[PDB]
Amino acid sequence: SQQPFRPRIKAQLSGSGVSGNTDFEANYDNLEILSQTIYPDAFGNSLRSKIKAY
Amino acid sequence: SQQPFRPRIKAQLSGSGVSGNTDFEANYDNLEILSQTIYPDAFGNSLRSKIKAY
């Protein structure tokens, strides 16, 4: 269902987590999503033939 | 077979007529027929599309 498409990446997690008994809320890691929009493009070409006899 | 059409109406009589002993030929009435001619007319409209891809 061809539409302008939007592919997304997620960056690498690059935080220190938690050590030992510390719970996750002391260092939550941030998921980051980057995006791009790809709009379609129509293009074509045609060939016209001669008369059937030829 | 939709040809040009021609309807007709019969007009209503007027005119004095004859009185007494006067004979009919002294005032003949006119049986008047009126007609109209309706000629057909062709008319139409159109919508063109963009490329199938669009």
Curated annotation (Swiss-Prot), chains A, B:
Organism lineage: Viruses, Duplodnaviria, Heunggongvirae, Uroviricota, Caudoviricetes
Origin: domain of life: Viruses
Species, as recorded: Helicobacter pylori bacteriophage KHP30
UniProt protein name: Major structural protein ORF14
